[PDB]
């Protein structure tokens, strides 16, 4: 709908399967040409480059993807706690760009390479 | 008078008689009245729950306990307008008629008057539109209706020294106030109005601040947004003719 309250609502309350679209990220130029899509659902296998926050300019492998919070953990993108331990700084996928895909799953690859649908 | 026709390349291609209506004396008060009415007529009825604040058997203790005679329940004041959680004294009401009437003649006169304001380059300029043209309104060949791509309309407008207005409208304003909490965060200037004949131009409609209409039903609002006469318009060969008998 056009009403702000409803829009935010449908987003925060979307069932799990509808949350994959909340973890999508734009694809590099090469990949876009390669699979005929502008973006994709970031997986725990892909490689990504940070284009916005304090970590803009860094690239790394995606270690985790939380659908509940719609965020991703990227290797080396961390914060150092008080006790010195290092923990990941969650990233919104819209601030990221996929530069390499993990196509170990037949289905994902088929979906990506299919034309009618996208991954 | 005479109006110059333009082809899809922006080149003169003959001309036709500007219909009489475009000579109707401009009446800003009538145009303002017509717009005010159309704006009021689409407003929705509202009002607070008629029982709001009345769901309580609260009663006043009266004299005797050194207290003001205020209805209370469980030691809490209620119902009355001065009481927190009490009813609204004279709130918005659903039964209220929020529409405005307007004689058909008076409204039709405004349409024609708003139409005529479209042929005065000085008014159009005073209204605020940005253009580098002398003749107004802009009359184009009917092939315009067959255009499909928005950018095709862009080229035609650039070739017509009229695209500046779209640039003017290519800036939204994020309004001050709580309208934002209800979906009215943005607003933007009104640019060019495209009047075609068969169906509104899908090719031009997405242009910043642009509006599209058909000669048979173009109204006072698209001709004079906000009630301000003199909108930079672009008619269609046939649109121009149909509008003559409005």
């Amino acid at each position: 709908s056009k009403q702000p309250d409803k829009q935010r609502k449908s987003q925060r309350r979307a069932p799990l399967h509808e949350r994959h679209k909340q973890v999508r990220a734009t694809l590099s130029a090469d990949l876009r040409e390669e699979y005929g899509q502008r973006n994709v659902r970031v997986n725990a296998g892909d490689t990504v480059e940070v284009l916005r926050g304090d970590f803009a300019g860094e690239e790394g492998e995606v270690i985790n993807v939380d659908l509940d919070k719609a965020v991703i953990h990227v290797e080396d993108v961390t914060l150092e706690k008080t006790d010195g331990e290092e923990v990941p700084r969650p990233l919104d996928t819209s601030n990221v760009r996929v530069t390499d895909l993990d196509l170990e799953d037949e289905k994902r690859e088929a979906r990506l390479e299919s034309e009618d649908d996208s991954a | 008078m005479q109006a110059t026709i333009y082809d899809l390349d922006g080149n003169t291609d003959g001309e036709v008689d500007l219909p009489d209506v475009f000579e109707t004396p401009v009446r800003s008060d009538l145009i303002g009245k017509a717009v005010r009415a159309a704006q009021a007529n689409r407003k929705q009825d509202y009002g607070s729950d008629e029982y709001a604040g009345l769901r309580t058997p609260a009663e006043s203790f009266g004299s005797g306990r050194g207290q003001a005679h205020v209805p209370k329940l469980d030691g809490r004041a209620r119902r009355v307008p001065q009481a927190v959680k009490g009813r609204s004294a004279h709130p918005p009401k659903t039964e209220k008629d929020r529409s405005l009437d307007l004689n058909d003649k008076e409204r039709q006169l405004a349409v024609r008057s708003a139409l005529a304001a479209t042929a005065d380059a000085d008014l159009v300029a005073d209204r605020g539109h940005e253009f580098d043209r002398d003749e107004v309104p802009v009359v184009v060949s009917d092939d315009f209706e067959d255009l499909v791509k928005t950018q095709e309309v862009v080229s035609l407008l650039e070739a017509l020294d009229v695209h500046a207005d779209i640039d003017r409208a290519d800036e939204t304003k994020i309004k001050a106030g709580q309208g934002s909490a209800r979906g009215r965060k943005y607003r933007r200037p009104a640019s060019i109005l495209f009047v075609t004949s068969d169906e509104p131009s899908t090719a031009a409609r997405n242009l910043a601040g642009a509006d599209v209409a058909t000669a048979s039903e173009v109204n006072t609002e698209d001709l004079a947004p906000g009630g301000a006469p003199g909108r930079l318009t672009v008619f269609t060969e046939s649109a121009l003719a149909e509008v003559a008998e409005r």
Partner: protein
Amino acid sequence: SKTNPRLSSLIADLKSAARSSGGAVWGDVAERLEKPRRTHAEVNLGRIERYAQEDETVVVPGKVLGSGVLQKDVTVAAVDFSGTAETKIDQVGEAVSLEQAIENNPEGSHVRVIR
């Protein structure tokens, strides 16, 4: 607090003419139009026919309506005329706007006020 822009201009033009020419009618007419609409004249043809005379412009500080019959060949100047009024008048004489009248006769001479 008139709302019609054309009425305002007319009233200003009428004053300009009265203050700059040998006319008092225009200033007079200006004053009556400044008064509330309910006091403005509403004259039918029958009245013009009864008190008008040729070569004496009939001036109506209001609007001319079409009831009755006009036979005299006179020039009627009014704020406005109904569609029929203007039609019947043009047939045997001529219908003119106060704006035209003020320009052809700024001194406002040989004129008869009718209401």
